[PDB]
Design a binder for these strands. Structure first.
Ligand SMILES: [Mg+2]
Ligand SMILES: [Mg+2]
Ligand SMILES: [Mg+2]
Ligand SMILES: [Mg+2]
Ligand SMILES: [Mg+2]
Ligand SMILES: [Mg+2]
Ligand SMILES: [Mg+2]
Ligand SMILES: [Zn+2]
Ligand SMILES: [Zn+2]
Lengths: 385, 424
DNA sequence: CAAGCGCACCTAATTTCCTAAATTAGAA
DNA sequence: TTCTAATTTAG
RNA sequence: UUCGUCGGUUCAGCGACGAUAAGCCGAGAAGUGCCAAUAAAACUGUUAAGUGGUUUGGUAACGCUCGGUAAGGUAGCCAAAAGGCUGAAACUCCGUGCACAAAGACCGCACGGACGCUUCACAUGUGGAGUGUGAACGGAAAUUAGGUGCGCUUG
């Protein structure tokens, strides 16, 4: 429902960077003071204070802390200060049992404390020129008069890539702006705006035009890829190789000095057990992405990572579990699913695939999985020749 | 003029109690130790806040002799914690509280400034001990009995132990010589600890002793340089002899790569695993990685020991009395060393303390263009960076390994000032 | 794969520390 | 009555 | 000719052993989440209204909490019963003592020899020393910085 995205700050719109930085550092100092004093006031409120300290008219911890710290930290806006106090007292109340028991000393806050912003204090807008603008109301009433900074401090953010969709939804009206924060990173020496967007998620429904292509990789066991989304899932069969080495060496040892009958049962049972966990995971990734259909090669060894696995059992179990979950399964002929590119489509080292006609580079197993994920790949492969 | 070292001693069995009762005693005392540490830190932080408020209001700082009733926070913390921690012995509790209050006092400004958070102490805190509460006696039949004083008087009545809790420890190897020297009188025991090793489920007695190192006669005008080279892990060179000693890393990063690969592989298997790995908690879901808990660290600890002892022994063999090395602080030094993710700080610390034992002074110098300076001439030119592998001095026709030249330049006394005068 | 949030688990780098004198109390 | 472990705090 | 347990500590070998251990199971409710009821601090606005989301009890999916699970070898008799005697078993061999009846706890220690073996020395040998599989043996806590894994969200 509530998730956050980061937007780097380019420049203040109406103020030089020096005044903006001075204001931000002063407000960071006030925020850290508010957090520490609120933690100490919460300590006093709960009754943890020692005997000598005592040798309140409010209702909750937050009210008393906010009213006490309101005087000294007058530069911060009332809403931002209240959010900071709530953060402090909520961190104290969660760790309350540990502090009393003695499993934790005291909550502490760093020097580069992010500043807070309530929903009704951060406003974002676009421009005809395309420059994305955000408006922040940080200072209180006396602070604006003291610093001669009127209106709200307009800023310019970087809105590109996967962040443009979120911002477009925010400005369109679908998403809403929740409580946000200003974040400073010392290393990169840049500021950020943690705009938290509020939205109603939609329950995914299986669509037959969403495919989860599947291939047996040479580096991993199975690589799952989709063409509608760049999400990727892989089954790294490390335990399979560990068990293979264990069984081979045990058979070598027991050869020297009925005995191996137990080994034959253990190998067969482990394959069935492994084929159940793999099938459950494979289908459960089609459900999460809503892939209404699954495309997998139908089944020599072919130098797959599972050197001598029982592929037919895995395919049958995948088919059965997909039928249970309302997922159709297709069997695509794997002629050149690995050699063909996933973007250019030119059908021209082992681990990393290359597209000499386009320069695209990715994992070879992922490339083959994506090629399989393309609908009706058999026909376009035939026509490609 | 006195060093301090430690040695471990595995505890076999409780001499008079059973292993179950002894384990319960140890767990309860661990809980008391952790509680005391956290409470001492809490009281220190509260007193800091009260002092600041008092200075702001009344105009002057409050003297602890009036408000607290004790001179320092250690005394007040002992007077407070001892009621709820009546199972630890008085000396051990006082030592623990002093450790906590000394850690808070050392970094008080950083705590107020915000660079350092308030210290918090973990679950498996080692038990503390002092020299007055540890005594070791050896029987005629080759057994070492450690009479530990771990409990308080109220705890003695409740736990039904009317004397010092005694344990039997294995004292072999160099541990045998250390214990014999302690009993004879050469080594004086200091505050010690009890630690638990989860991998082997073994308790250890961590005796820390004080001793006078054997300081020989070594002139200060014989200097050995050390460079964490690009090809060889550590290259050693001298100015008076053309002697070169190398420590090429036959096995350095392979161990870390293997352990990290295995850990990542088994961690990613939590999504598709058996039915008994999910549904029982975080510790059980991450159970398979407990085999790789300390393989990377322990391998490097032994590897850094082997390198350091070899380095120190070479200094004695050539008769040196000074070891100059690099100042890697803030990663200002060369970013391309043969070791990739090694713990250079641990290697440097080991070299420092072993040299101090061997009566050798270690001096750190700031490196600037050290791999490019010509030892024979002194011309600071950057044109000899041939992959940081072969050094060819054009101005002198000198060809040699870059690591040897770097170590030789570090071996020149006051190399930092010489460089600063040469180019700045 | 990329970018955020939450949680915890691993490495390294850096620092401080590794009391003790005096008094009391219980057992011989 | 002597004495050796605990116990308390100064610095 | 893979992982792991024991053989004093770390790394490596060796001897025995165990492994589907990247496996199996149990209890419970501090958290994430789900179900139900209730709606505090604070802010803007006269007030009305809005933003904000607080407290309590349930269920039991969880990288939810607490946990349990395999791994070296060892000698019997006497008395009715307590106890007594003999002295087996782990990283070279022998002798003499001390200590050991079931062990999470015992398989060890000291002295004298042999046999290897690491240093040194004096003339391939000879003699001192350490040495018993090889190397090593200054750790603990905390903070800081980075990385990783899992879950969620967007592309
Ligand atoms: Mg997605
Ligand atoms: Mg014994
Ligand atoms: Mg055992
Ligand atoms: Mg070992
Ligand atoms: Mg025997
Ligand atoms: Mg001998
Ligand atoms: Mg050994
Ligand atoms: Zn292409
Ligand atoms: Zn030159």
């Amino acid at each position: 429902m509530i998730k956050v995205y980061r937007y780097e700050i380019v420049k203040p719109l109406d103020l030089d960077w020096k005044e903006f930085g001075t204001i931000l550092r002063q407000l960071q100092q006030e925020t850290r003071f508010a957090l520490n004093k609120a933690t100490q006031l919460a300590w006093e409120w709960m009754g943890f204070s020692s005997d000598y300290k005592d040798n309140l008219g409010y209702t909750n911890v937050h009210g008393y802390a906010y009213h006490t710290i309101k005087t000294k930290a007058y530069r911060l806006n009332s809403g931002n200060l209240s959010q900071t106090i709530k953060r402090a007292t909520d961190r104290f109340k969660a760790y309350q049992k540990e502090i009393l028991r003695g499993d934790m000393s005291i909550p502490s806050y760093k020097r580069d404390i992010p500043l807070d912003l309530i929903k009704e204090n951060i406003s974002v807008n676009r421009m005809n020129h395309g420059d994305y603008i955000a408006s922040l109301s940080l200072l209180s009433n006396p602070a604006k008069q003291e610093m001669n900074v009127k209106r709200k401090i307009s800023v310019i953010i970087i809105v590109r890539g996967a962040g443009k969709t979120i911002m477009d939804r925010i400005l369109s009206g679908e998403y809403q702006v929740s409580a946000s924060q200003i974040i400073h990173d010392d290393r990169k020496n840049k500021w950020y705006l943690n705009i938290s967007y509020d939205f109603e998620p939609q329950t995914r429904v299986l669509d037959l035009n969403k495919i989860m292509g599947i291939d047996l990789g040479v580096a991993v066991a199975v690589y799952m890829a989709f063409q509608h989304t760049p999400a990727r899932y892989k089954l790294e069969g490390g335990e399979i190789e560990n068990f293979r080495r264990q069984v081979e060496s045990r058979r070598i040892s027991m050869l020297r000095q009925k005995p191996i009958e137990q080994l034959r049962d253990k190998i067969a049972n482990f394959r069935d057990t492994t084929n159940h966990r793999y099938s459950r995971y494979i289908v459960d990734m089609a459900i999460k992405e809503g892939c209404g259909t699954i495309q997998m090669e139908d089944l020599d060894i072919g130098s797959r990572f599972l050197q001598n696995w029982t592929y037919y059992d895995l395919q049958q179990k995948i088919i059965y579990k997909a039928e249970e979950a309302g997922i159709k399964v297709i069997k695509i002929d794997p002629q050149y699913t690995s050699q063909r590119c996933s973007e250019c489509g030119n059908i021209d080292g082992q681990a990393i695939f290359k597209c000499r006609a386009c320069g695209y580079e990715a994992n070879a197993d992922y490339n083959a999985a994506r090629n399989i994920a393309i609908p009706n790949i058999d026909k376009i492969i035939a026509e490609s020749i």
